[PDB]
Design a protein around this ligand. Sequence first.
Ligand SMILES: N#Cc1cnc(Nc2cc(NCC3CCNCC3)ncn2)cn1
Ligand SMILES: N#Cc1cnc(Nc2cc(NCC3CCNCC3)ncn2)cn1
Length: 248
Amino acid sequence: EDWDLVQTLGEVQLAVNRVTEEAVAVKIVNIKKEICINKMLNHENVVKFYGHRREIQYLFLEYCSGGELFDRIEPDIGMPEPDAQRFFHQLMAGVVYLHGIGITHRDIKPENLLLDERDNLKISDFGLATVFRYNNRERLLNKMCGTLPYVAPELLKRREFHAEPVDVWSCGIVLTAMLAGELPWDQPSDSCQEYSDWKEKKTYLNPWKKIDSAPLALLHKILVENPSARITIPDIKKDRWYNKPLKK
Ligand SMILES: N#Cc1cnc(Nc2cc(NCC3CCNCC3)ncn2)cn1
Ligand SMILES: N#Cc1cnc(Nc2cc(NCC3CCNCC3)ncn2)cn1
C-alpha cells in the first residue's frame, strides 16, 4: 500500500511500491472527466489506469520505461522506416480502440505517445479527451483543442466537425515526423506557406522529399484538407505501405 516517490518524470512522478517494487506514474493536479474516461480504458496500446485518490487529486497511471516517442525521432532524420511502420500500426490499434468506445483523444502527438519496456506504443494523457459517440449517436465537436502543428484544418475553419478525422490527421503528422524528423508546418492554414506548398503538391520540398513514395502515398490520403474526403482508418488498414513487409 506504500509508495515511494522516486523522481519527477515531467507534474508526473515515478512511484515505486515499498514491498513489490512495482512502478507507477503518478499524476498530480478537466480532471473529473479525465478520470471518468480513464476508467473506461483497457487496451494494450493505451496507458493503463490503476485508480485514483482524492486528498489535490492523484491519478495512478502506467509507468512506460521506454520513454516518449519523441525521443526515438532523430531531428531532421526521423527513424528507420520499419520502426516507424511498427509504431504506426500500434498507434492505429490504439486509436481504433478509442474510437470504437466512442472516445477521441484530441491531442495525439509524439509527446503523448509513450513506450513500454518492449517499445510498445501507449497512447497517454486523456486530459483533453472527450466522448464523441454515445448510445450509438455521434455528436459533432466544436471546441478548439490540440496542438497547432498536429491539428486538422477543419478545426481552424469550421464551427463544427467530426471527431474521428481529426485524430486521423494528427496520426498523419506523427507519421511524417517519424519518417522525416521534422514537422511539415506551423499550422494547416492557407496563410501558412508550407501548408500551401503541400496543397499544391510540391513534394520535391522537405519534409516530403525525405519520405519514400509508398509511405508518402499514404500521407497524401491522410493529410487531405476536406475531412469528408480524408481516408478513414479501415482504409488506412488497406493501404499498400501499411501492409508492406519491412525489415531493418
Ligand atoms: N502512489 C500510488 C498508488 C499507485 N497505485 C495504486 N493502486 C493500484 C496500483 C496497481 N499497480 C499494479 C501494477 C502491476 C504491474 N506493474 C505496475 C503496477 N494496481 C491497482 N491499483 C495506489 N496508489
Ligand atoms: N496523463 C498522463 C501520463 C503521463 N505519464 C505517464 N507515464 C510515464 C511518463 C513518463 N515521462 C513523463 C511524460 C512524458 C511525456 N509528456 C508528459 C510527461 N515516463 C514514463 N511513464 C502516463 N500517463
